[PDB]
């Protein structure tokens, strides 16, 4: 059965106006800016941007990937996709 989302697990996320985008649930390093209560940060593979969602918003990248992981258009995704795939643990910064 399912836990909570913890740093490291793999997703699609979603964001009004955008396609469902390979992602990671980050870390937060020390010192570093937390998210505001009931959210997480977000680490969007390809844009290498970093927003705080909600459950409602993450999918499971296993269970997803049928529907979300095909080529999109927009900036990023592509990159996006070969990263959460071959490498989705690396650091990006």
């Given amino acids: 059965m399912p836990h909570a989302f913890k740093p490291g697990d793999l997703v699609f996320a979603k964001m009004k106006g955008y396609p469902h985008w390979p992602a990671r649930i980050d870390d937060i390093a020390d010192g570093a800016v937390k998210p505001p209560p009931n959210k997480y940060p977000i680490f969007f593979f390809g844009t290498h941007e970093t927003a705080f969602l909600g459950p409602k918003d993450l999918?499971?990248?296993?269970?997803?990937?049928?529907?979300?992981?095909?080529?999109?258009?927009?900036?990023?995704?592509?990159?996006?996709?070969?990263?959460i795939q071959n490498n989705p643990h690396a650091s990006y910064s």
């Fill in 59 to 83: 999918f499971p990248y296993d269970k997803s990937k049928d529907k979300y992981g095909k080529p999109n258009k927009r900036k990023g995704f592509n990159e996006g996709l070969w990263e």
